[PDB]
Design a protein around this ligand. Sequence first.
Ligand SMILES: COc1cncc(-c2cc(F)cc(CNC(=O)c3cc(N4CC[C@@](C#N)(C5CC5)C4=O)cc(C)n3)c2)c1
Ligand SMILES: COc1cncc(-c2cc(F)cc(CNC(=O)c3cc(N4CC[C@@](C#N)(C5CC5)C4=O)cc(C)n3)c2)c1
Ligand code: PRO
Ligand code: PRO
Lengths: 483, 483
Amino acid sequence: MVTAKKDENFSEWYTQAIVRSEMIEYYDISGCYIMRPWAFHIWEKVQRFFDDEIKKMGVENSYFPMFVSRHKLEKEKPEVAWVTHYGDSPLPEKIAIRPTSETIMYPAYAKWIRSHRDLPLKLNQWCSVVRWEFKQPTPFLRTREFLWQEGHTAHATEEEAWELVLDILELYRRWYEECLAVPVIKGEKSEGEKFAGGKKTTTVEAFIPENGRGIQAATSHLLGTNFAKMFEIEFEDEEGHKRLVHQTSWGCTTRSLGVMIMTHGDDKGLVIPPRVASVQVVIIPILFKDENTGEILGKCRELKTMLEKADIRVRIDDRSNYTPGWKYNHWEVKGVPLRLELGPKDLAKGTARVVRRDTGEAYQISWADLAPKLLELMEGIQRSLFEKAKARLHEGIEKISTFDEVMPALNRKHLVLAPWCEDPESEEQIKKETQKLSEIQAIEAGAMKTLCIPFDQPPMPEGTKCFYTGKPAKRWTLWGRSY
Amino acid sequence: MVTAKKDENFSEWYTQAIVRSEMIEYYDISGCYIMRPWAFHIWEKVQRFFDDEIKKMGVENSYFPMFVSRHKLEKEKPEVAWVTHYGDSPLPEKIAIRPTSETIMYPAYAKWIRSHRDLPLKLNQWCSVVRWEFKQPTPFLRTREFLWQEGHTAHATEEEAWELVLDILELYRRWYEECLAVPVIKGEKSEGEKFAGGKKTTTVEAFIPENGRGIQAATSHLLGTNFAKMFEIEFEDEEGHKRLVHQTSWGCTTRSLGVMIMTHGDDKGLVIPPRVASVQVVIIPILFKDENTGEILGKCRELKTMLEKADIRVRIDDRSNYTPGWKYNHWEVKGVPLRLELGPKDLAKGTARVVRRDTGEAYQISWADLAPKLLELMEGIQRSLFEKAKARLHEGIEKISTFDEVMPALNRKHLVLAPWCEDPESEEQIKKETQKLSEIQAIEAGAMKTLCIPFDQPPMPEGTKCFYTGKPAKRWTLWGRSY
Ligand SMILES: COc1cncc(-c2cc(F)cc(CNC(=O)c3cc(N4CC[C@@](C#N)(C5CC5)C4=O)cc(C)n3)c2)c1
Ligand SMILES: COc1cncc(-c2cc(F)cc(CNC(=O)c3cc(N4CC[C@@](C#N)(C5CC5)C4=O)cc(C)n3)c2)c1
Ligand code: PRO
Ligand code: PRO
């Protein structure tokens, strides 16, 4: 049983939820966590979805090395792990473990791209990267090693690369919202937050109500020609002139599982959206000692067969050594969206009892309706999870016009949406001031930064001033405390 | 065009074949190679096959960390890469990159397994490992980083673990023989060659005729209780007694692509078995300037649609800036098994010309027969590739009775099958003597080791003596030079 309450000790609740459901295991190297099959299966599902979608765009998978030479990493010139010795033997030149693969892939890119006919070049890989920070890790959300995909494309024109950046960002919206039922906000990162060496960084941002923090959910960068200049990636037009390619890179990580967990979980533990649950329906037979158990289990198997014909993912928990009470809790903690109960009374009526994980609502369903009804219930659970989260997201954002409204909204664990002049020095000043005010507050018991400049801009009245400098406002920006 | 001949400069031929077909790219860190999509797709295919098959056995995927602490690696107590510094900051205790994950996973195993009801525990992961040897690498076959899967299971009894070892070894036979059309020999490794700390190691072995070398294709270990003792992995029976679990581990790598390449390739370059080719049929339209090109390309698209309805994997190379001659060679080098040619004369006859990659045989096929006929041709190419390789394998093995027959058979680039007493010291002596004889031979221009003790044992006459000690022979053993 999960016992910490999500709304009272959030970090303990999260730890319990992911450990008791068998999603993660601890490890003797700090900041690394084991992903057990119950979490792993969800990764496999979103991985298959995203793979299928990028294949339709002509992206192909590949595999580049996990090591990068010191001097190719220096061509770009920090949380980088260095390998220095093969066993006992010191290396002649230390090599780093990839934190990202731009400097690993792009010398190959330069070799492969010769003519405009070679473009676009579109590659992805699934692997893990390492970012070795000493700060406190958080399972899924901030870990020293994490699984991701990174996609890396090259085009003849800037407009083609930017269209691809936005197509991918839309795939990331679908990954969170369609697969994980997590609402996200599209937008552009500020100049100070954008990717090192990139031209423009787009993001989808999510929000964790319980601690008021925004979290970057996925990212899609217009690199433009910046890395092409660095690595001499050029193509020939049909007339023979050499031109720089225009590039994109984009990535999504197992952080997405963390965000799903926190968005949908409740005081009983995990709640997994039907579209990614590896077990959508757990069938629990009632097994009175004074019953035809063989008949009950037989009907369970028949119902499994029937539901699987509709591509529903079913498990029968027929263990006689645990009570139905124990099983209910066990599969609740694990987040299975639908529980189906079959005992002698149901068998005699030709119905089953079905309980949905998100609300506890129970239904009596005849066996003949079971597949279409469960399909409909699963789509309804998925939509409900998403819409309720969308409502919490919207309740979480305060639209302000002056800096004096910031700290009251932060103290409500809200994000703010404010008219901003987009001066980078002002973002630095806002970070430092809000951090100071937070510290001063904590003495009586930090920083607010930009999360993104949303694509969907509310109306900007003609003379509106930046909320912090009083200069002309340029656009609405979303700010908050952040991961 | 590939220009080195497979039968004359084998290593140059292999390099050309994998580079010119765009399968691999070089990298500035020795012993690591980039896998471009043309090779990567074949990995994805065999990966899907093996995943599907182990899932039916109840194995589930997971992901364990890439790092292992010095002292958990010492619990077992060398080609191990050590991480010592996060950027500038020296680590308090150096950590190694995984060469294999037994010591990473098995402390978790010990924590998770409490009762016999917890068994069997069956996990797999797909990742890369590093084995940092200074010797000369070979793309796919011996690399410093390589992709694999490793599966790790734990059972209540030794017989259950051994049945699983053999079930997996059969999956590896299917991986090579059914998917890659590469014949392999099942058997048990000798005491000196078996896995460190394991009880018994089984293998499937392949043979490379052009250099006479056996190569271990995949491996499936009975660990028995050895690692359970090391890591305290114990379970409780129903009466409450604690017993050691019995374990297996097993792995397969991208070496398998290397073996496929070398087995089927010819002087024109790659030949890819239809069951794993990412392009099974390349459609090449003839594009005379004085023709209805639109009609020709339209019919190409229709034929693609029709073939894809039969799950055939099709690409249309409709580029006008290359000749059909150039395209024929380009897709030959890449190993596409079937080429389909459509020009105005074919269109007028309602037929297509189809050329198979392995023999060059051409066929005229009416459009109505095209899907069933190509399906049949692809199964015939797959079978032919396999049977011819099976014949080369069989021609490659000499059955001997005395040590004086070894060097003549090695000089024929053959393996030998000999009655052996299985004394480990004799294997060491045979390695050293055959290496010396080889050196002495090379002066006028090394080692033979056991490859496996085959499951399929030829008849052993009642008084047959070991071929090297003259002691009683125990079993037939397969020996050869080796990777
Ligand atoms: C208060 O204490 C902290 C403050 N700041 C950092 C940490 C921290 C602690 C650690 F122990 C280890 C690390 C290193 N891992 C990461 O930084 C990281 C980044 C991301 N990112 C970055 C943005 C991105 C998106 N979208 C990009 C696509 C990639 C995405 O997913 C995802 C994950 C799982 N890990 C950070 C702790
Ligand atoms: C004459 O020069 C040499 C002599 N001896 C070694 C090398 C060499 C050169 C290097 F630069 C790097 C390395 C390290 N990589 C590997 O040892 C290795 C082993 C395997 N293995 C081992 C057995 C196995 C099977 N079945 C097990 C499942 C795993 C399987 O696939 C596969 C691959 C791709 N790499 C070795 C060079
Ligand atoms: O790390 C990043 O943000 C980009 C996207 C994945 C590859 N590099
Ligand atoms: O390296 C080996 O041979 C075994 C099988 C994969 C995991 N460890």
